Amino acid sequence: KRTLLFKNAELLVTMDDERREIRGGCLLVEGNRIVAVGGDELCAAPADEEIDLRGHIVIPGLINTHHHMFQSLTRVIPDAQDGELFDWLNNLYPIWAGLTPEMIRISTQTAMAELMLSGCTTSSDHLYVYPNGCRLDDSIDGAREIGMRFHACRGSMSVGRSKGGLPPDELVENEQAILEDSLRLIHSYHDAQRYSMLRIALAPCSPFSVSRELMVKTAQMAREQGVSLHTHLAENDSDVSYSQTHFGMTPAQYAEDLGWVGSDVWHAHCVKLDRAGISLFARTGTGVAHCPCSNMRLASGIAPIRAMLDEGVSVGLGVDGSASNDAGNMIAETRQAMLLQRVGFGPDAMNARQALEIATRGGAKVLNRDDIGYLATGMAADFVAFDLNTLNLAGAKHDPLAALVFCTPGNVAFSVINGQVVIREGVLQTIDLPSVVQQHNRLACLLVN
Amino acid sequence: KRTLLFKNAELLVTMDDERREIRGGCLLVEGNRIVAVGGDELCAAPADEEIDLRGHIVIPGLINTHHHMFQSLTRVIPDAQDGELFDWLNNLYPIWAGLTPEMIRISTQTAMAELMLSGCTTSSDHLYVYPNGCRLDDSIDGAREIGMRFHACRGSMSVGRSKGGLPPDELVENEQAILEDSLRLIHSYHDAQRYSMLRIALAPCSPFSVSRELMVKTAQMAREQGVSLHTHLAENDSDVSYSQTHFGMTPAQYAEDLGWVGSDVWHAHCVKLDRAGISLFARTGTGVAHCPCSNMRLASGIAPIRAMLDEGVSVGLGVDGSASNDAGNMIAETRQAMLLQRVGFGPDAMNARQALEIATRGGAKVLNRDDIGYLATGMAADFVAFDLNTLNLAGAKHDPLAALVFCTPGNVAFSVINGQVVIREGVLQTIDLPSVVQQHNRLACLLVNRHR
Ligand SMILES: [Zn+2]
Ligand SMILES: [Zn+2]
């Protein structure tokens, strides 16, 4: 098996069980997994390829736990730039009706490229529209070319505007079709073993877009098949009122009532989750995908992340779809989580290591994976390296780790995913990025005009 | 004098009085000023050099209205990353006591380089510590090397621990020395003419950091000499309580009491300004430097920027010192101003164009300048260009202007300051940037390992 040695990192951040931060640290990789982590004599190890990381910080690859990568074709749509969750959706649904399988394939690559160059090695997605013959398969095809570790969610909507829901009737599907497609996707694509590069989750989009019947059946199938469940929960005030008006419950009560609690569940946003819901999630092991830029750009609110963490809730990080961020920058999202918790809850609400922990270990937890998220023997060989001698970080070498969260670094210098060196000296190796960006912009023009 | 044609920008954002956004726009420059703004008809203009901006957006240069560039040597100090503001100041003051003139010279260039590469063409600074023979002259020297348009503030502190303050016995100066140095700096450096590359302002660190007498003479000297006044005001709950307890008035009332209102005054932060203070600033023309990343990173609060703007207060943008941000990224700070206003006050509190106006015209206004901040005939030739065909902006060409605020672009592709092309295809031209960064980190190492 192919061996790879990364040697002489200025700081090697492990996020391991001792949270070791090794000066001069070295990483030895074999195949897709880590052999050993340390300094000293391990740096003298021969290997099939050695890469010198002097002047760089190495961290575990960041883990993105919420996205809508198809929306990277529709950033800053003029009619959608100003306004809240509902109304924003109302202006964007008509544009998304034009999506083709090619747009799904290319936009998965574009969004994934932006995430990979900003430090991310594992991401989920939440594709929930399937017009014009689009399939989750098209997104999987693109994810396979670019080499990122992928948790593909079969998103869905069934309750159109005629039935008391939000999406237009054209963009929703029949619930039996959804369940059959979900089962097909699991059987064809879900790899449940260690170091898997592709897993499937089931993800009805939100309580205002799907029936409770589909929520229960989806959960039943996921438990039967051994896969996770994902949805939007308590994103803003309208979300909370809709659930109170239509179902007589808080979003947390509604989730538990449907079986959507447990370590195989993770909810996006949870901005308006109440103290009772936080305790419920803590005791059931239910996960949260925190999306701070989205929560700001849509004026959703400040999620009570510090309160969730203090009760033992599992919190990961997500950029959300690029029509509500509108960036796809993972390390910048980690910075935002620190800044927003501090402005919301005080100077002790979130430091650099706590935010980075959410962005790594927290993401592994909410995706229900124990093989990513930190660097130790037997873990997946997923990590990135930032050049510390850039202008962006000048004067911040007093703490190379905090520098990534308190400053605004550029792209990663190196990225390793599943043992593959996918980024080399700032250059994405697995696709022709200028060509994909070029195609992406042509398709985006086609989609909107 | 040298002439320059920038042609065929995908979108040329002028921020002029009609807020023209010109498809295919062109800019004709002579010396330090804009000769014409228009479309392809400008391509028949002769020029010493043509620069093709196809695929790029051009905007007016961003204007930074608050900084402490010396702190770029002391980012993420472990003792100061977390904790309360008392611990922030108390742990950083002893380190800044080691600052040398060379450190001031170099860190000005480092901080200005980060600002310039992120879209900024004019900045103020607020140097308020002068140990070991450091002088505002040293930062002026570094700014002249890099070519940025510069509003250098003679910051000051006089109230040390002996008089109930925080800084050590000294970072604080004798109050007569401060004024004599202030007058010297004005006489030696302040250039009051149009297109000036250097202006001086007087900037006690806060109204509580100097005697009431010093606040008053300083304002008197500034008015006599025709220069502006700058300070920290109403940054947090402690400032409001101190001034209400100790002086019996709100910070804005105390500012009015000292003569620190007027169009030649701009106050940093103003996070905790009340409705009455907002009205006072609106009618006196007093400016605000809004610093969103610092206000979050130090847990100060959300400044009521939308309320200030609705009342007619002049608001600019600032990154603040690099120990309280800790980035020096101007376009990211413009994004943050939008994001933070929306989460504080709702989806109508700030759009991309309103945020970009604050970052350009708003900064020009609070610096009391009518020759920068937008692109029109006779305005200073200060503008930057971002490549629209990058990964970062992929799928955002539906609105090239909003893309700069809603996405996270990389460095500018081109920057022109006072007619000089200071950045060319992403490369800073006026200094050897890798060498300056090397010196900067070496000096930062020396500074933190000093005996104290
Ligand atoms: Zn979402
Ligand atoms: Zn300041």
Short mmCIF file of C-alpha atoms and ligand atoms in Angstrom, two decimals, chain A residues 66-68 71 126 128 232 235 268-269 294 320-321 324, ligand 1:
data_model
loop_
_atom_site.label_atom_id
_atom_site.label_comp_id
_atom_site.label_asym_id
_atom_site.label_seq_id
_atom_site.Cartn_x
_atom_site.Cartn_y
_atom_site.Cartn_z
CA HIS A 66 -25.39 21.28 5.62
CA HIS A 67 -25.53 22.63 2.07
CA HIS A 68 -27.67 23.00 -1.05
CA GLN A 71 -27.91 26.87 -5.24
CA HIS A 126 -29.28 18.56 0.93
CA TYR A 128 -34.36 18.59 -2.36
CA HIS A 232 -34.55 21.89 8.63
CA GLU A 235 -34.94 28.10 11.49
CA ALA A 268 -30.12 22.14 10.42
CA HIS A 269 -30.20 25.59 12.11
CA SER A 294 -27.07 31.80 6.62
CA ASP A 320 -25.92 26.08 3.94
CA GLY A 321 -26.88 26.59 0.31
CA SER A 324 -28.35 31.92 1.57
ZN ZN C 1 -30.70 24.65 4.18
#
